[PDB]
């Protein structure tokens, strides 16, 4: 009633009539931003300079009927003068503290619910457990780490529609919330905020912060989880490590680690089946995680892992920028390449066809507990530097780079029974078979690679056959460095194809993923994975 009367006044006024008739709804935002007020070039000087004047603050005009004109000492608390481009009135800051000492009171039980994230941060810190300070060289690796620790893994656009459906259910538009996760999130969030009386703009902002995922490049050592990055100013330094345990855990860490385990198990089964893709799809449909189905997470969740990527692509979803090989994630960074479809022999005299690439090319190898950088040419490796944590990590990176190089020094180092076919005359992949052969131990590949000199620049460490650092002469091209750059986080989402046997391929024709790159490791899910097809023990 009050608003329509205001409209009565607006339509009666000619100037208002002008603005209302000519302006469109599209320009309402522009007219919301229409202001003479220039933005402060030096805000500090202008908030230091103004706080020495009477009436430096502004407030709504209702202050005139809520706060008195002066306090007991006689200091004036508000004036009748109005702001420049507003109806608001100029008031001193003593009206604020007066409000805090003599103003109306309310019930702030809503605010913990509103600012949920901040209170989980406080509770996690209050219950955390510190330990010994360990002074030691800190190898800080720049890496993409999620900052928000209660993020429901929804993008800004993805979660703004859930926020609207929760708070503004009639202004959602054509966007239909397909995913089950979104509908559960909607109902649950709707329930807590049934009567919240703070502000729908700040309720929406809070829900955005809580539900919207956020990632930020940060130098990280030690733990990478989300609860471990909010305290990165406290756990990790340049010369000191601080042992610390979060008091709590978040659903996103569990959702991620359980999705990874589920997809790994699914792919492991699907590989031995007759039609891996059909089995994979049927398993992905008949399975769910923590009640919410897994496909919802698969469309909703961005996660970097070979099995998750295979699952997503099999569901026709977008995947990572560059290929995987031997459990490591390679991203090319220079040069072109063409395959050749050529033939060669081994040291055990077995003949094999492979595809060797052309041109000089640089690559950014990546992994779980290591990192590396590679430069090579047609059939020829040029150099490989590694930045792993443990020595066996550097060994893994070096053997992976040598197999990837397709050098004859590696081909002519194969000794023993290495069958390049299955037990039924089925052609396995040569590269993967070499990588499994050289994974028992590569003594001969190390003793046959070669040696070169080094300039001893940067104090870089030498290579190790059997734990013998050599600081002046070492294998050719292979170096080791303290500290790595990670790099791969930026992702140029590439389009791809998939074979029946789960061979991912880019638009060109090269191979990007395969069921052999997924780990052989057997983990234990953090959230309960529930599979209902006929037998509840097959995953």
């Amino acid at each position: 009633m009050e608003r329509i009367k205001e409209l009565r006044d607006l339509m009666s006024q000619s100037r208002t009539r002008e603005i209302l008739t000519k302006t469109t709804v599209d320009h309402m935002a522009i007219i919301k931003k229409y202001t003479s007020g220039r933005q402060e070039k030096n805000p500090a000087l202008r908030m230091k300079w103004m706080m020495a004047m009477k009436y430096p603050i502004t407030a709504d005009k209702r202050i005139m009927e809520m706060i008195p004109e002066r306090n007991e000492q006689g200091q004036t608390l508000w004036s009748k003068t109005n702001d420049a481009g507003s109806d608001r009135v100029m008031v001193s800051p003593l009206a604020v503290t007066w409000w805090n000492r003599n103003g109306p009171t309310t019930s702030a039980v809503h605010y913990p619910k509103i600012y949920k994230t901040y209170f989980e941060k406080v509770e996690r810190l209050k219950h955390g457990t510190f330990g010994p300070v360990h002074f030691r060289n800190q190898v800080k690796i720049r890496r993409r780490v999620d900052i928000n620790p209660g993020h429901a893994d929804l993008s800004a656009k993805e979660a703004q529609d859930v926020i609207m459906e929760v708070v503004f259910p009639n202004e959602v538009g054509a966007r239909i919330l397909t995913s089950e996760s979104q509908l559960t999130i909607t109902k649950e969030k709707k329930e807590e905020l049934q009567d919240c009386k703070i502000s729908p703009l700040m309720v929406a902002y809070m829900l955005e912060r809580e539900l919207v995922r956020k990632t930020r490049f940060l130098p990280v050592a030690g733990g990478t989880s989300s609860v471990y990055i909010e305290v990165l100013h406290l756990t990790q330094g340049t010369c000191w490590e601080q042992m610390y345990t979060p008091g709590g855990e978040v659903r996103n860490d569990d959702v991620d680690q359980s999705l990874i385990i589920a997809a790994r198990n699914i792919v492991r089964r699907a590989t031995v089946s007759a039609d891996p893709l059909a089995s994979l799809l049927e398993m992905c449909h008949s399975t769910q995680i923590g009640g919410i189905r897994m496909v919802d997470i698969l469309r909703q969740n961005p996660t970097e892992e070979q099995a998750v990527d295979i699952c997503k692509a099999a569901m026709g979803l977008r995947i990572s920028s560059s290929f995987s090989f031997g459990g490591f994630t390679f991203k090319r960074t220079s040069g072109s390449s063409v395959k050749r479809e050529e033939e060669v022999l081994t040291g055990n005299l077995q003949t094999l066809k492979i595809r060797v690439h052309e041109g000089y090319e640089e690559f950014t190898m990546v992994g779980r507990r290591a990192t590396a950088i590679l430069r090579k040419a047609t059939r020829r490796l040029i150099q490989l530097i590694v930045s792993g944590r443990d020595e066996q990590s550097i060994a893994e990176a070096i053997i992976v780079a040598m197999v990837f190089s397709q050098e004859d020094c590696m081909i002519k180092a194969v000794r023993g029974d290495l069958n390049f076919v299955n037990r039924a005359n089925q052609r396995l992949n040569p590269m993967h078979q070499l990588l499994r052969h050289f994974q028992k131990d590569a003594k001969v590949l190390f003793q046959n690679w070669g040696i070169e000199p080094i300039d001893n620049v940067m104090g870089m460490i030498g290579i190790l056959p059997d734990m013998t650092p050599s600081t002046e002469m070492s294998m050719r091209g292979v170096r080791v460095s303290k500290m790595g750059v990670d790099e791969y986080s930026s992702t140029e989402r590439v389009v791809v194809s998939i074979d029946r046997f789960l061979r991912v391929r880019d638009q060109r024709g090269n191979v990007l993923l395969s069921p052999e790159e997924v780990s052989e490791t057997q983990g234990t899910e953090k959230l309960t994975i529930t599979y209902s097809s006929s037998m509840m023990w097959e995953v």
Binding site: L7, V25, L45, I63, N71, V96, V231, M483
Partner: protein, 738 residues
Amino acid sequence: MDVNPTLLFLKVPAQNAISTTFPYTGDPPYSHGTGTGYTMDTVNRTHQYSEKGRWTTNTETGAPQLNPIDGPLPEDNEPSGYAQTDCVLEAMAFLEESHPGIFENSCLETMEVVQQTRVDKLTQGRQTYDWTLNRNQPAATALANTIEVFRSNGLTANESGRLIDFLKDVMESMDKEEMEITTHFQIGKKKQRLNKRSYLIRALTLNTMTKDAERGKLKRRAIATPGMQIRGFVYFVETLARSICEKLEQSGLPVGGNEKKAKLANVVRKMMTNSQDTELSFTITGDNTKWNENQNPRMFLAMITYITRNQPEWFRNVLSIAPIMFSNKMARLGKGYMFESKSMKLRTQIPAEMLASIDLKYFNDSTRKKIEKIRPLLIDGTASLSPGMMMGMFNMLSTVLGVSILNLGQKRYTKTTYWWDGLQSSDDFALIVNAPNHEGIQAGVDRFYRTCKLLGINMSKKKSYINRTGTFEFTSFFYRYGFVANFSMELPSFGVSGINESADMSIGVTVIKNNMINNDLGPATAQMALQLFIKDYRYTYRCHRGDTQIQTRRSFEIKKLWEQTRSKAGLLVSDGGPNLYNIRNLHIPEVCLKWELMDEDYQGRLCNPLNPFVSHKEIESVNNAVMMPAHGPAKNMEYDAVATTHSWIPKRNRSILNTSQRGILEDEQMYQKCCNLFEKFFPSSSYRRPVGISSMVEAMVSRARIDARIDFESGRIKKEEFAEIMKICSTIEELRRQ
């Protein structure tokens, strides 16, 4: 003994103490008066570095333009803007050859953006030269005034609410024989007309200003601000250029400081460690002199034409328009000049527009020479600036050219034992050239210099040097066998930010935590930063512990609050309470840190929605503060904070009351009143900007009708009220139609 801190560098390397060489604790140098002199100087310089070019007279603007592209080749090591179109195109071709499909994909992305993009995004911008008032005005104010003048003249396609339609309207505005603008005096307004040439020079012109708070230079520089017509085309061009630079491992401009450091470290390591021990490798940590002056918009048009190869023609035109306008861009001279008569003891402000006519008795020899050189180019108070870019509007395309020249040393194109690679961010580069001997290094650096002078990219010998690989500098990042912390660039961010009490507290603690994360700030230094920030906070905002005897104008309310409260550890530093912040608690706001210690009465007074102090306008500004970093571009600081009674907005300048444009305040007031009513009708007007193509009143009445019917069917509204509402709905519709 006389003390000398520089001798400290005889034991500690210069990179492990470089913070000592940064005098960032004192007032930054500022300009005081007009920037006309620097504008004239820059125009005459950029017309000097291209003087062997060809002159022309524009048939549309009448301006004399100097075109140096495909001009003669340079003969000395002085600056030159004679870029070669064939060489730029060859650079682009080799870039595409080394990174295939990059231009196709970038054009597809930018086409999607063009199809999706809207007009409201132009409100998110810096100061913009309004061409209706000839005055710098906020981006939204300038956009609104331009839209109003367009609709008053006849250009009305923009109701579509698309940026490309606003650009079509800008293009059809130029083919009209007379615009109609409005001018204020002192209170009313007056209609005025602008023939085609006048409107053309107003749409193509740029405003000029002096750049304050710049660290590292004795002499002041000028900067430009474009109008509303160029802003959309330059936005689209920067979208394309960002999309391209994102897919290049050699660019560094679209990424942050940490990604710059990552790229730099990978490149220096690659050129050092990956290269063989037999090869030598040398790093030139260089800069480019007169970068913007020598960057012709015609070669940017060539780059846009190449990048868009085999793309739709509409996309080609929309991206070509911006280089076309920059090639013809004009520069407003500035504020003018002040003249003092000492004998008569008086001062006088002459506007710059009279300089075309003013006698030259009143100027010093330097200014006399500048005016004499610029007068031929002066047309109606503005100087034709065709021969070169003014200040970094096309930054990312320049970075693309730098990455092309850096990519032309891949060793497939040099065809020689030497090669090179590096990282370039506009006006700053690091180039590691690897070669088997010092003759190869010299040949590589000579070919780099020469290939850089054939593309209009000049290398600063004054600011570049070559050493062996392992130590270098890039954008004040000092790499010495690993990156090193500086902390002197980040020093001006360690005080009160000047937004409000809550915001200043949150920003200070978050800046401390960030400087702890990225720039290796220590634990003791972080604690000291907390303590000093809190002292400055308390002294600025007049909020002392409350158990003190500091007599201020705001010491009485704080004492009453201190005495009223039983639990005193629950008060905020803004209300006269203790400081519970430490290293463990840098990631938590000041309201959640103190929530179990607060009294329920104080807790409910502080956190109250009915307060007259808290106002929030849009979701974008709720917790984001534009913070200008020193020796860097103005950034945006996300600051986690809790909405309390301390989260006010501060007052406005209030000088506009004494000027002819005083009636803009009433427009502001009505606009905000109306928008508040619309938000009442549409609750989500603040969160999500409304879209459609309907006049506001029709939506208002339609929502009123829906609300009334719903309320009557099952709500408070009774039949009499519903009838009255529907009667007014009909009355309003009739009034609107009339």
